[PDB]
């Protein structure tokens, strides 16, 4: 019975509630992102949890520019919020320098708003993995926050449930030469690994990022490749 | 509601007597509107068996006349639909359903002898819906047994019929508990398993009779007389062994009588599958357990 | 029992002790009631006197909040009191914004909104008061209203706040409401707050009764209960 | 578990929070059932009222709150963090009817009533209005639409939808329901609405006690159904 | 298919109170209402959903 | 128990005793006693000193020409609910030029009062008012409470062991209303010589009265205007 609450450190140890939400975020959806030669693919898994639900409505894979890619693992209800928060901050950054703004400017920022929140002492933290790409200047990025603030960059990862096992075939699996169709294929397979038995069009939910800009890719080229793709 | 009902049913008495259908058409109606009351305990169900009971007069003038069934299938439309829109959850209002379909096996037992197949069976095939749907009933059990049994009556006995008694058989041993008629009942599939032949089905359905037990008290005799079909369970088709039980059961019924040649054939039957039991341990033995009859040693083939 | 201490937090089992709490607490308050009839709202109060040491015309929790509104208000008196002032203050600015008299349905609306934000936060305590709100239009007839602790606020025809909730409800539902015009309904309160306790747990009461509808022209006033004297010539004939 | 007496929001361990699960049965203290189905070109919702008292009146019982003159929505849980609710979203309705020039379509409007609710659960020191909220509305090249809000923030939208008490039972009822691939003629909806709450419930009762939204891709105003044309329906559907 | 979760002993409480019910009608042949009467009356109780957050 | 330190919390029996302990220190102030005929209000108070050699703690306060306060409590909210009330009384009397009814400004007290009395970070008020003043229709006897009920009466006495006062007020409530300054006066301090234990007596510089009439200003005295006061008397019937 301590730490409670955000203001005082523990007596050896870290941070116990930023490791609480960052035990919700593994306890979330899985999901799965992969930075090739050329584009980035990020991949959800997103169950109803009837058959009566909508899959047009709520949107995993989401944009936030019309070169950046970006997916989350955790829950919506704040995802959306500092999806928000960090669509204003790119269109201040278009305004002040009439560019758009670098995936790395924005994963700094993104980070300092979330540390602010880390601070303390009434907020809780985010219980959202962030997983950031886009292509800026050539080369493609892949950028992972977490909700301590802190950031990273991957060649491909995953977040979620089991994403030991996911991330155990990836260090198999993947490598650092491929092209986006290669990637589309080894990120379906290592959610395929980890996911319910039955994948349809609409359990999964794609996005990719070429050269030429950030895609969302539809029902329609999803159910066409992911029709016993191996 | 009461009163409700009072206005109505003793003011709609009058006009059966006279009038064709047109009233009970102006009566459909009302019934359905004394049943969207239907006052939880005892007023509009008991005000309701009153005018079904009128609605059986209209069925007297009416279901009396031509045999048309039109008129009846639409009392029972809407009857259908005054128990449908009307759930009686066992909230103490069924009694509209009781006398009505008692009144109605009782024109059914009038039909029987004055009515022709077709609107007798159309009666069956609503009240299958009507008992097996509307919360099964003791009597319209009985009257269940009745009239399935004039279903079987209708070509004496066949195959079709054979189902009917093996889809009802064991389906109500279980709802409402009962000790004499239902074996009367549960008797009668032996002949419709003799008439079809099937021995095996026939000790299916002794796998049925033997699930009855505690055959006793019921009346005076009438497992004694029912020990006819005991036997006729496997009196020809009988084996040597399995029939101690059966060829006893021989013996017991002229238990009762003091004749000298129907219980003479239960001595010599009692005393001559002893030649179809092979050797055994119940043989040498229970040939003088029964040994001991004063009426026995008056045999020339019981000596031999 | 926990867990009941904020106005923030929830329960295991999913309420707020503190509005429970605060709701019966005008349980233990003076019995009101009210009822309207076919041309105007009646008001009706249960007030006791502490021993001799009042006045007869102090403290009177029938208020004037506008020219047509007044509360009925039971439970504590001065809370009822800055929630009277709070609501001349919204027909205040409805008055001064379109010119013309409030409807008692946005009335309500914004005291029921403005006792549910003194619900919801952790720095405030729920009120503990339980009011009702009758008026009268020529456009719309007469109206009356109630408000919980909570902040739960919609219509009636009659009501009773206080000990006998039920106990006056019993009695006041076997009236003829529709087909009466008020000054009927006048000695009707009375005879209905004279049921209620006459003698057994305290030893004196005396009555209020308040007065809106078409015989006052709109107007919101108390009756001149003396003219007429319609409870006690007719009090001591409700003894038998 | 706790342990930590949940009495803050902040994160426990094995992960999850206590407060917005607690708040999830706040509608189940309301005591009610509400049913909203989309099948074609209309939209129906249902939901009954709860009167024991005669001397208690019935037009002001309405838990059908006209949003807009296109939007309509009910309520379940507690009334005052409905009623709040509702005008937080007339506010912010008539907020971009200022705004933008133009009638707000109805998945913005859930998703700004949304994120109040989460800037109500990020910050703490606030209650988080247990209550649960079902949207209905027409949209121009989408047709007509059903969505639902959660205390929590999380607005999902979809085709038979059902919040209160009983609606396991509910939608254990649409999802036997909603699989069979017929039209749904909207006389089709209003009979599956009346009979899924008259089988969940299973009360068969008055006219008197439901009320009916509807909204229509013929006039895209939002309307409730009159007693008369109530009783029409239910004897429509009494075989 | 559906996420029940009712670990690997209360499968045969399943088995014992709806075969049992069964034998409340004294059959010893198995319907799918067994199944729906075996999961409404077994840890149907927590349950669902919760399908926020995940 | 644990329930009951602030003023947020509702009791499970719905009785906050923030509020019941703002009452019972109220009821550790001294005696008190306000009294008013058809013409003329009148309250008398008791004064205590800190030792022999000291002066006395005064109790009777003026606050504007037709207004004046009795007090038992606290003194700091005392004086300040006294500056508010000198304020809020030059305040009308700078902008409608008039005096102030006393109904409103007791209500304006009850106002003020109030907020101490609902959020949290504030005290409830000790404090022990007996207002006399005068409107067009006469004077009038209000007190108040820490739980801001105001109430209006003919007669009252708060402060300690102010029982016995209110039990004489009972058997001469019916004689309070016909007489003059002078015989209403002493019914006040023979109600004050029962508010003391019976082995000591009033004496002169422990007592005060404070006067206002229907055309005599608000006016306090210690013990010159006082000695005609004090004689007139006989013995306590022992």
């Known amino acids: 019975g301590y730490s409670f609450s955000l203001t005082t450190f523990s007596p050896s140890g870290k941070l116990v509630q930023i490791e609480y939400a960052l035990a919700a975020v593994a306890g979330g959806a899985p999901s799965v992102g992969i930075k090739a030669a050329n584009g980035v693919v990020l991949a959800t898994e997103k169950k109803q949890k009837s058959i009566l639900y909508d899959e047009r409505s709520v949107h995993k894979v989401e944009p936030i520019t019309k070169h950046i890619g970006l997916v989350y693992s955790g829950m919506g209800p704040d ?48 219980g959202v993995s962030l997983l950031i790409c886009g292509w800026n200047e050539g080369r493609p990025y892949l950028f992972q926050s977490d909700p301590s603030g802190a950031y990273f960059a991957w060649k491909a990862t995953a977040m979620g449930k089991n994403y030991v096992n996911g991330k155990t075939f990836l260090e198999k699996r993947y490598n650092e030469d491929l092209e986006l169709e290669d990637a589309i294929h080894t990120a379906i397979l290592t959610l395929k690994e980890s996911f319910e038995g039955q994948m349809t ?30 | 509601m009461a009163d409700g009902g009072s206005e109505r049913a003793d003011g709609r008495i009058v006009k059966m007597e006279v009038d064709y259908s047109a009233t009970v058409d102006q009566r459909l109606p009302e019934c359905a509107k004394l049943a969207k009351e239907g006052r939880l305990q005892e007023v509009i169900e008991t005000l309701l068996s009153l005018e079904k009971q009128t609605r059986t007069a209209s069925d007297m003038v009416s279901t009396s006349r031509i045999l048309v069934a039109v008129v009846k299938m639409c009392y029972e439309a809407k009857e259908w639909d005054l128990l449908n829109e009307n759930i009686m959850l066992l909230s103490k209002r069924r009694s509209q359903l009781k006398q009505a379909v008692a009144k109605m096996v009782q024109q059914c037992c009038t039909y029987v002898e004055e009515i022709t197949d077709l609107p007798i069976k159309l009666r069956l095939i609503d009240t299958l819906r009507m008992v097996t749907e509307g919360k099964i009933y003791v009597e319209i059990e009985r009257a269940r047994l009745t009239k399935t049994l004039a279903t079987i009556k209708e070509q004496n006995g066949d195959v079709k019929e054979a189902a009917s008694i093996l ?138 | 029992t926990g867990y009941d201490l904020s106005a923030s937090t929830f329960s295991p089992d999913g309420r707020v002790f503190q509005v429970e709490y605060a709701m019966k607490a005008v349980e233990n308050s003076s019995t009101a009631i009210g009822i309207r009839c076919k041309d105007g709202v009646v008001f009706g109060v249960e007030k006791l006197v502490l021993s001799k040491l009042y006045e007869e015309g102090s403290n009177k929790r029938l208020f004037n909040v506008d020219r047509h509104v007044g509360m009925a208000v039971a439970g504590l008196l001065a809370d009822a009191r800055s929630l009277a002032d709070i609501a001349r203050e919204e027909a205040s600015n409805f008055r001064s914004n379109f010119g013309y008299n409030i409807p008692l349905k946005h009335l309500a609306d914004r005291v029921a909104m403005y006792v549910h934000a003194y619900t919801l936060y952790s720095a405030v305590r729920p009120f503990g008061c339980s009011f009702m709100l009758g008026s009268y239009s020529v456009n719309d007839g007469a109206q009356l209203y109630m408000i919980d602790p909570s902040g739960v606020s919609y219509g009636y025809w009659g009501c009773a706040i206080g000990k006998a909730r039920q106990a006056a409800k019993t009695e006041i539902e076997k009236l003829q409401m529709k087909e009466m015009t008020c000054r009927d309904i006048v000695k009707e309160v009375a005879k209905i707050i004279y049921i209620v306790h006459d003698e057994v747990k305290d030893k004196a009461f005396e009555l209020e009764l308040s007065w809106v509808g078409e015989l006052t022209n709109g107007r919101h006033e108390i009756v001149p209960k003396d003219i007429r004297e319609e409870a006690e010539k007719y009090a001591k004939e409700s003894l038998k | 578990s706790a342990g930590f007496d949940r009495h803050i929001t902040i994160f426990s361990p094995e992960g999850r929070l206590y407060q917005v699960e607690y708040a999830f049965k706040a509608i189940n203290q309301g005591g009610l059932t509400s049913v909203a189905v989309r099948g074609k070109d209309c939209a129906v919702i249902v939901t009954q009222k709860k009167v024991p008292d005669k001397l208690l009146d019935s037009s002001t019982v309405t838990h059908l709150f006209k949003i807009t003159e296109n939007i309509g929505c009910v309520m379940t849980g507690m009334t005052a963090d409905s009623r709040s609710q509702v005008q937080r979203a007339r506010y912010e309705a008539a907020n971009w009817k200022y705004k933008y020039g133009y009638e707000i379509p109805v998945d913005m409007l859930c998703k700004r009533i949304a994120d109040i609710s989460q800037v109500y659960t990020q910050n703490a020191e606030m209650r988080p209005l247990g209550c649960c909220m079902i949207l209905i509305g027409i949209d121009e090249e989408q047709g007509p639409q059903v969505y639902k809000c959660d205390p929590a923030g999380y607005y999902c939208g979809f085709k038979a939808t059902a919040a209160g008490v009983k609606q396991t039972e509910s939608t254990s009822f649409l999802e036997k329901k909603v699989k069979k691939k017929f039209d749904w003629t909207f006389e089709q909806t209003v009979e599956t609405a009346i009979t899924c709450l008259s089988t969940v419930l299973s009360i068969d009762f008055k006219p008197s006690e439901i009320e009916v939204g509807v ?22 559907l009494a075989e | 298919a559906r996420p029940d979760k009712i670990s690997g002993a209360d499968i045969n409480s399943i088995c014992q109170e709806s075969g049992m019910l069964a034998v409340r009608e004294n059959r010893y042949i198995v319907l799918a209402k067994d199944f729906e009467k075996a999961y409404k009356t077994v840890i149907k109780k927590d349950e669902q959903e919760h399908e926020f957050y995940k | ?129 007996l207002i006399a003043g005068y409107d067009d229709m006469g004077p009038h006897i209000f007190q108040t409470c820490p739980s801001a009920n105001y109430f209006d009466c003919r007669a009252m006495s708060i402060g300690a062991r102010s029982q016995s006062a209110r039990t004489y007020l009972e058997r001469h409530m019916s004689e309070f209303m016909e007489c003059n300054l002078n015989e209403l006066v002493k019914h006040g301090l023979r109600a004050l010589r029962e508010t003391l234990p019976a082995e000591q007596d009033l004496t002169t510089k422990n007592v005060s009265i404070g006067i206002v009439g229907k055309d005599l200003e608000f006016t306090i005295y210690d013990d010159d205007d006082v000695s005609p006061f004090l004689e007139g008397l006989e013995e306590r019937p022992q």
Not at chain 1, 205 to 229: H, M, Q, S, W
Not at chain 6, 70 to 85: P, Q, V
């Open chain 1, 79 to 126: 995802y959306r919020v500092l999806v928000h928060r960090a669509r204003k901050l790119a269109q201040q950054y278009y305004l002040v320098y009439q560019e758009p703004i670098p995936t790395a400017q924005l994963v700094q920022r993104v980070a300092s708003v979330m540390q602010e929140y880390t601070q303390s002492g009434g907020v809780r933290p985010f």
């Open chain 1, 201 to 230: 069009e609409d359990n999964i939910e794609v996005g990719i990022c070429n050269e030429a800009g950030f895609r969302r890719l539809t029902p329609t080229e999803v159910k066409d490749y992911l029709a016993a793709i191996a």
């Open chain 4, 215 to 236: 909204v229509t891709v013929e006039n895209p105003k939002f309307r409730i159904l009159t007693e008369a044309e109530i009783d029409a329906h239910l004897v429509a």
């Open chain 6, 1 to 129: 128990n644990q329930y009951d330190n602030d003023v947020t919390v509702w009791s499970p029996q719905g009785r906050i005793h923030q509020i019941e302990y703002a009452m019972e220190a109220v009821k550790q102030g001294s005696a008190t006693v306000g009294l008013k005929s058809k013409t003329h209000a009148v309250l008398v108070a008791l004064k205590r000193a800190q030792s022999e050699l000291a002066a006395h703690q005064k109790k009777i306060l003026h606050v504007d020409n037709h207004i004046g306060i009795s007090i038992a409590g606290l003194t700091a909210d005392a004086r300040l609910l006294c500056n508010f009330m000198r304020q809020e009384c030059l305040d009308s009397r700078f902008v409608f030029d008039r005096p102030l009814p006393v109904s409103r400004l007791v209500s304006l007290i009850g106002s003020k009062t109030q907020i101490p009395t609902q959020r949290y970070g504030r005290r409830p008020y000790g404090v022990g008012l």
């Open chain 2, 167 to 304: 889809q009802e058989l064991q389906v109500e041993t279980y709802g409402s508990m009962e000790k004499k008629e239902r074996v009367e009942f549960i008797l009668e599939q032996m002949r419709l398993c003799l008439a079809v032949k099937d021995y095996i089905r026939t000790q299916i359905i002794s796998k049925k009779i033997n699930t009855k037990f505690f055959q006793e008290e019921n009346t005076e005799k009438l497992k004694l007389k029912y020990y006819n079909l005991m036997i006729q369970l496997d009196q020809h088709e009988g084996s040597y062994l399995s029939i101690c039980k059966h060829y006893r059961a021989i013996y017991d019924t002229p238990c009762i009588q003091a004749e000298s040649e129907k219980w003479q054939q239960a001595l010599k039957s009692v005393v001559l599958y002893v030649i179809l039991a092979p050797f055994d341990n119940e043989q040498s033995d229970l040939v003088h357990r029964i040994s001991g009859d004063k009426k026995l040693e008056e045999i020339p083939k019981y000596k031999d």
